[PDB]
Amino acid sequence: MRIEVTIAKTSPLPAGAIDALAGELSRRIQYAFPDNEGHVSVRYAAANNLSVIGATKEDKQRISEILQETWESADDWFVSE
Incomplete structure (x- = not known):
């Protein structure tokens, strides 16, 4: 299964939060x-x-x-530095 998350650029997160978000989400998915296999990606988009590919509605x-x-x-x- 592949999981992709897009965040609107109009909402900027601190220079460390995106990476933190992707890491927390991945751990949650694996559990x-x-x-x-769950792969999570986070990027800025308009x-x-x-988007979820290879998964069931439930x-x-x-x-x-x-x-x-x-x-x-x-x-x-x-956690923030």
Whole structure:
């Protein structure tokens, strides 16, 4: 399964957050999907978009939920220099 996340450039994150986000998301994906290789990429695009290839609708809802939860727990897993 391949997971791609795009963030609108109109919303800049500190010079370290994107890499941190991609790392946190990947760990979450691996825990949720032990039997399937998950690859997560994060890049700036004209618009915010989430694309999932090689997954089922239920997997995709769970992933959206995971993204929601990780995103909501940002103060705990995100560290800034």
